[PDB]
């Protein structure tokens, strides 16, 4: 009775019409200007893409189809006896724009359970990878290697009319989200629990729960952390590196597997999702240098040394946000409720009182406040997931939700190839006069 | 005596200063406006990035550091007894902006020969891949898997000061360009010449020549075709999908291996580099449907059927070009000189007289003229390289030259994270009033 595909079939034509008319009336309306500094500055401040699933406000933070994090916490269906929102429900919301029922949520969970399966070539590849090959690299290679199963790639090769692209994107998206946790978990076990198996999917559990089981964790609170983690990391508008990458790549009609893998290559950057890992490594050196309970003056010192060495302080700053990331706050609230006395948590809390001030003092960062990455690893470590080089994988798994939801829409709406004009410094100087 | 690294060490600081001053004077100067239609239209017509290596003119085609194709043909050093420009020389030009000497060119060739080597994990992976896994997917997975050797990734993890990034990018770039042909050729042999070996690199030959040897081709004209192919496919300004992808991904400080692999995922799109493959498959069905020597009326018919079925005609049209791609012309001239009587060539020639007109008649395409992809496979087929699903790999190998040359510069110049602002249809409607 529940079928997302049928819901979308109704939704698509209305949005098409709506955008059509809008463009009819405002296509030539200017929404902004481009300056030399924006071009040199990684398009900072440039309104450049249409991305429907979520929109980030510089002061208020992210909204998912118009809802804030607290709103989601409050509205989305939870697990039986749970407190944290099920990522399945978030997916529904991103895709349809509507809050799902628990019934709808359970369908998503079954669907994902049904579609979870890995081809042998992929298993073989993962099992043959060296342990010194970073987890994100293993993840991206595996997803790329899965493209042999692409239903979209297959339909395209058959000559499908462009109007049906969305339908095949939808299938691969659902298939890929379903397989993610199996891939991710196989990496975890191969690297850190050599000789054991991820086991099988329980068609009766939610996606997060099957995932934690494959990871080998039994604590129920951990399952709850996972559900939250996976929900809040899902999407962050379209201009962030990973999302933009999926967008750009999909625009050329590469299948979702290839688009998602390219995205992961972007998430793996130190200035992007790798920060979650970098924060923990930074904290480890800290505690190692100074030792467990540091004084504020010592913390300051340590921060300055980093800045003075031509490095960034991981987990702080943002290209768009101008205040503390609500994702950070949300994590803080979780810690406060569950592991208030953890020394690492306490360290993280202490830095919140210090880092921003030093950054302010330094005068370079536009946003001296923390971002999501400053608070995620600390939670993970508490539950026994101490493998910091693996943290980004979790982020990657989450992010699939947002980017794949948009991807369906991009093709439904007929968005064309992303192809802006570039310029050379010399050409630009000429364009103006030069300086 | 020749050392590109030392040359760049001198060049870098001057460019820095120059850009510094320019921005001082013109940073706030507006170079353009953004309209609703540009945002909905994949940034078409938006001046959005700085990319130094090459600049595309909509009428005149591509210029590499200010030189046109014919100019390069004429200025770049050739092989002994050769006619086509050595890609090594093109690389030098992109990187330094100066035409290299033959001596300089030979150094590049030695350097690339010296650095060529594959780690076992990568060889193992390639050898275990299934034959139904597309060549581009095999290629991207392999490059990603090579990141275990990244010198940049390693330095970053060591805390290197940001000012030295370029130095490590340069090393990985040279290493990666050197390994490309080994990877690419191993794929070719595994898929199409099962049981044979690529053999070893001859430190005495140019890069193209070692590549053709590993591919197993003996014809000297083929070596010449390769040199040309690899040179002309090298770069095409910064806003094309593959380049933009490398740019975006590298901007987050992902290493060159990861940035290049993501790019390949974009090149593999049917609207991008996969077109070279698609053109040949389209021609094969053509010849199959109609049979070898078709009438113009039949060709028209066949074209219309494609268009009427909601598909594109591969190899025609362009996001920026508005006239026939000089890369196409350059290939035509090659064919005319070497395989003037080939029936497929002749077919390709015939379509040039017909396709544009049909496209014009249809009234949708902005540019009814052919692009590079319409003429490349035909040349390859003539020499016995009939594996059309492999053609994009060649493109990928070439493209490494341009994107990696820019990548060094992006980090030298300190370009920040690419992170534009996105918008939702609803948010945008509000911003204006809505339509
Ligand atoms: C998130 C970043 C990349 C935003 O970049 P951008 O929009 O260019 O920041 P900005 O405009 O404030 O930069 C202005 C200057 O302050 C510096 N600065 C910014 N944040 C800084 C930080 N955390 N530490 C040190 N210096 C910093 C910038 O590097 C830049 O210096 P230069 O002018 O000398 O280049 C930046 O804040 C940063 O590097 N932060 C640390 C890395 C991090 O935490 N990344 C994860 C972010 C969230 C995410 O994507 N999660 O997945
Ligand atoms: C190269 C492309 C993607 C440029 O896209 P874009 O800048 O959006 O083209 P455009 O503005 O002319 O598009 C206007 C309309 O004409 C259509 N059109 C454009 N080229 C077309 C073609 N070759 N066949 C059929 N329809 C075409 C577009 O799809 C679009 O239709 P809708 O409005 O219904 O969406 C386009 O010309 C195309 O699809 N060409 C065929 C594929 C191809 O040859 N790709 C390789 C290009 C070069 C390259 O990257 N090599 O690596
Ligand atoms: O929004 C950004 O640019 C980066 C970020 O926090 C995310 O992708 O989660
Ligand atoms: O310029 C473009 O957009 C596509 C193209 O021809 C290339 O990348 O070679």
Chain B contact set for A256 (CB, 8 A): none
Q: Which of B228, B175, B233, B243 is nearest to B409 (CA)?
A: B243
- Interchain pair B424, A50: CB under 8 A: yes
Q: Which of B308, B366, B420 to mutate to test the interface with A (most CBs of A within 10 A)?
A: B420
Task: Decide if A424 touches B, using CB distance below 8 A.
Answer: yes
Q: Which of residues 33-72 of A touch B (CB under 8 A)?
A: 33-37, 39-56, 66
State which ligand 1 atom lies nearest to the alpha carbon of A272.
50
User: Is A419 annotated as ligand-binding?
Assistant: yes
Q: Of these residues, A206, A244, A373, A375, which one is catalytic?
A: A373
Cβ(B232)–Cβ(B327) under 8 Å? yes
Q: Within 10 Å of residue A59's Cβ, how many Cβ atoms?
A: 7
Q: Identify the helix (H) or strand (E) that includes residue B106.
A: helix B102-115
Residue range(s) in chain A whose domain bears CATH number 1.10.230.10: 275-389
Cβ(B88)–Cβ(B109) under 8 Å? yes
Helices A4-26 and B425-432, interaxial angle, to 10°? 30
Distance from C-alpha of B353 to C-alpha of B421, rounded to nearest angstrom: 44
Ligand 1 in reach of A360 Cβ (< 6 A): no
Read off the tokens for B381.
Answer: 């087929």
Q: Which of B169, B75, B194, B182 is nearest to B118 (CA)?
A: B182
Chain B contact set for A243 (CB, 8 A): 422
Q: Within 10 Å of residue A93's Cβ, how many Cβ atoms?
A: 24
Q: What is the DSSP letter of B370?
A: B
DSSP string across B162-179: GGGHHHHHHHHHHHHHHH
Q: Which of A119, B168, A146, B192 is nearest to B184 (CA)?
A: B192
Q: Give the ligand with the smallest distance to the CA of A392.
A: 1
Distance from C-alpha of A33 to C-alpha of B427, rounded to nearest angstrom: 18
Interacting residues of B425 by C-beta distance below 8 A, sequence separation 6+: A15, A18, A19, A22, A50, A52
Residue range(s) in chain A whose domain bears CATH number 1.10.580.10: 1-274+390-435
Which phi and psi angles does B300 have, rounded to 5°? Answer: -55, -50
Resolution in A: 1.9
Task: Decide if B373 touches A, using CB distance below 8 A.
Answer: no
Query: From the CA of B365, how far away is ligand 2's center (Å)?
Result: 6
Q: Which of B195, B196, B227, B232 is nearest to B211 (CA)?
A: B227
Give the end-to-end CA distance of chain B in Å, rounded to a whole number.
66
Chain B contact set for A51 (CB, 8 A): 422-424
Give the end-to-end CA distance of chain A in Å, rounded to a whole number.
66
Provide the CATH number for the domain formed by B1-274+390-435 in this structure.
1.10.580.10
Q: Which of B249, B217, B241, B201 is nearest to B380 (CA)?
A: B217
Pairing of strands B61-64, B54-57: antiparallel
Q: Which CATH architecture has domain A275-389?
A: Orthogonal Bundle (1.10)
Q: Which of B225, B228, B214 is nearest to B69 (CA)?
A: B228
Distance from C-alpha of B351 to C-alpha of A149, rounded to nearest angstrom: 34
Cβ(B91)–Cβ(B153) under 8 Å? no
Q: Give the ligand with the smallest distance to the CA of B307.
A: 2
Q: What is the DSSP letter of B383?
A: T
Interacting residues of A406 by C-beta distance below 8 A, sequence separation 6+: A51, A52, A53, A94, A235, A238, A243, A246, A247
Atom 4 of ligand 4, nearest CA residue: B240
Distance from C-alpha of B144 to C-alpha of B401, rounded to nearest angstrom: 17
Tell whether the torsion through CA atoms of A270, A272, A274 and A278 is positive or negative: positive
């Amino acid at each position: 009775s529940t079928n997302l595909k049928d819901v979308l079939a109704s939704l698509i034509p209305k949005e098409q019409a709506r955008i059509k008319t809008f463009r009819q009336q405002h296509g030539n309306t200017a929404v902004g200007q481009i300056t030399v500094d924006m071009s040199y500055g990684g398009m900072r401040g440039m309104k450049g893409l249409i991305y429907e699933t979520s929109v980030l406000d510089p002061d208020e933070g992210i909204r998912f189809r118009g809802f804030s994090i607290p709103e989601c916490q409050k509205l989305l269906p939870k697990a039986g006896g749970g407190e944290e929102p099920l990522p399945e429900g978030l997916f529904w919301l991103l895709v349809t724009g509507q809050i799902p029922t628990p019934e709808q949520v359970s369908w998503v969970s079954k669907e994902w359970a049904k579609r979870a399966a890995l081809p042998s070539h992929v298993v073989t590849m993962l099992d043959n990878f060296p342990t010194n090959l970073h987890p994100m690299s293993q993840l991206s290679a595996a997803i790329t290697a899965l493209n042999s199963e692409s239903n979209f790639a297959r339909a395209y090769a058959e000559g499908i009319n462009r109007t049906k692209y969305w339908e095949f994107v939808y299938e691969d998206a659902m298939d890929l989200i379903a397989k993610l946790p199996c891939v991710a978990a196989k990496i975890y076990r191969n690297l850190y629990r050599a000789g054991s198996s991820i086991g099988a999917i329980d068609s009766k559990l939610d996606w997060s729960h099957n995932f934690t089981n494959m990871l080998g964790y039994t604590d129920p609170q951990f399952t709850e952390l996972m559900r939250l983690y996976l929900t809040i990391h899902s999407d962050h508008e379209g201009g962030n590196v990973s999302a933009h990458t999926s967008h750009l790549v999909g625009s050329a009609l590469s299948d979702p597997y290839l688009s998602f893998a390219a995205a992961m290559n972007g998430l793996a950057g130190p200035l992007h999702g790798l920060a979650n890992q970098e924060v923990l490594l930074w904290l480890s050196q800290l505690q190692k240098d100074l030792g467990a309970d540091a004084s504020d003056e010592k913390l300051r010192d340590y921060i300055w040394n980093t800045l003075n060495s031509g490095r960034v302080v991981p987990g702080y700053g943002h290209a768009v946000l101008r205040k503390t990331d609500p994702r950070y706050t949300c994590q803080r609230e979780f810690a406060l409720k569950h592991l208030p006395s953890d020394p690492m948590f306490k360290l993280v809390a202490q830095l919140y009182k210090i880092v921003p001030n030093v950054l302010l003092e330094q005068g370079k960062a536009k946003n001296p406040w923390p971002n999501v990455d400053a608070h995620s690893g600390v939670l993970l470590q508490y539950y026994g997931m101490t493998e910091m080089n693996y943290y980004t994988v979790l982020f990657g798994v989450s992010r699939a939700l947002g980017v794949l939801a948009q991807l369906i829409w991009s093709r439904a709406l007929g968005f064309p190839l992303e192809r802006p004009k570039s310029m050379s410094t010399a050409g630009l100087e000429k364009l103006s006069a030069g300086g």
